[PDB]
Amino acid sequence: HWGYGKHNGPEHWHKDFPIAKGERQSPVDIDTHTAKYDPSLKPLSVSYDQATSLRILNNGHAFNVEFDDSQDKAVLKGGPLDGTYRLIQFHFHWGSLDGQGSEHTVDKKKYAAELHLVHWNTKYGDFGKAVQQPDGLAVLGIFLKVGSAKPGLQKVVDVLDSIKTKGKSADFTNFDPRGLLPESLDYWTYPGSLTTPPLLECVTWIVLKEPISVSSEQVLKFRKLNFNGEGEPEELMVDNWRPAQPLKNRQIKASFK
Numbered sequence: 646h647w648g649y650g651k652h653n654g655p656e657h658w659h660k661d662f663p664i665a666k667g668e669r670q671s672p673v674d675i676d677t678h679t680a681k682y683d684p685s686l687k688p689l690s691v692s693y694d695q696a697t698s699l700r701i702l703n704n705g706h707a708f709n710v711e712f713d714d715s716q717d718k719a720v721l722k723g724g725p726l727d728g729t730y731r732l733i734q735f736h737f738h739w740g741s742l743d744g745q746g747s748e749h750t751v752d753k754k755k756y757a758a759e760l761h762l763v764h765w766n767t768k769y770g771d772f773g774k775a776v777q778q779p780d781g782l783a784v785l786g787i788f789l790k791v792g793s794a795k796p797g798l799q800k801v802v803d804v805l806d807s808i809k810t811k812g813k814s815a816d817f818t819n820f821d822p823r824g825l826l827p828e829s830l831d832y833w834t835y836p837g838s839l840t841t842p843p844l845l846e847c848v849t850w851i852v853l854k855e856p857i858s859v860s861s862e863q864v865l866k867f868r869k870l871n872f873n874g875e876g877e878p879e880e881l882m883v884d885n886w887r888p889a890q891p892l893k894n895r896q897i898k899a900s901f902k
């Protein structure tokens with residue numbers, strides 16, 4: 646099955662998921678000089694005051710912080726979006742070293758990591774129906790750079806020892822994702838896809854310009870996770886990022902001048 650190795654990594658995904666070579670794949674390089682300011686874009690509305698995290702999961706590809714999405718409790722609206730998108734999970738992608746890890750790039754710059762907050766359009770009723778629609782998901786992407794610690798991330802880092810290997814989960818209630826957000830909500834937006842199989846072309850991407858800072862210690866704890874299951878040969882969970890894909894017939898729009 647798919648993964649991030651030599652034998653099963655991104656460059657192989659098209660054989661089981663031919664949409665890998667589609668017209669609206671993610672991530673992409675954001676060329677800041679050609680992304681056009683669009684005055685018609687709105688401010689993003691991120692409303693996470695009632696977000697109810699439940700659990701953290703090592704799925705063998707990353708770890709997922711999961712939310713109760715059975716009501717409108719943590720929603721993303723505005724920005725480029727029509728309608729209301731409910732938070733279902735967040736996860737990250739990161740590198741073996743601080744010089745790579747992000748999926749999106751900015752003028753070819755790779756960040757140490759990238760956080761994805763995944764939301765589904767309530768007009769489709771559930772996540773599985775939403776991913777079948779071109780406007781089914783909104784993913785908020787936030788770059789991580791290594792410097793100062795992010796106090797709001799520490800609760801996540803400290804639970805990782807308990808989900809070292811694939812298929813482990815742990816209760817993870819009361820975590821507030823507002824602690825992961827940068828000061829500015831300036832963004833770039835474009836139409837794209839999931840970045841892991843099945844690579845469905847169902848995402849409005851909203852990539853924040855301003856990175857968050859996390860400490861080296863924090864990212865080092867991400868890199869102690871395992872792709873493998875309990876008791877199998879240890880292969881560290883690192884470099885779980887898809888590289889930039891062809892932009893094709895897309896425009897990247899900026900919310901800011």
Ligand SMILES: O=C(O)Cc1cccc([N+](=O)[O-])c1
Pocket residue numbers: 761763784838839840841842843
């Ligand atoms: O389980 C999976 O890998 C598919 C999946 C599910 C939810 C979000 C995703 N994304 O690319 O942001 C991908």
Ligand SMILES: [Zn+2]
Pocket residue numbers: 736737738761840
């Ligand atoms: Zn992701």
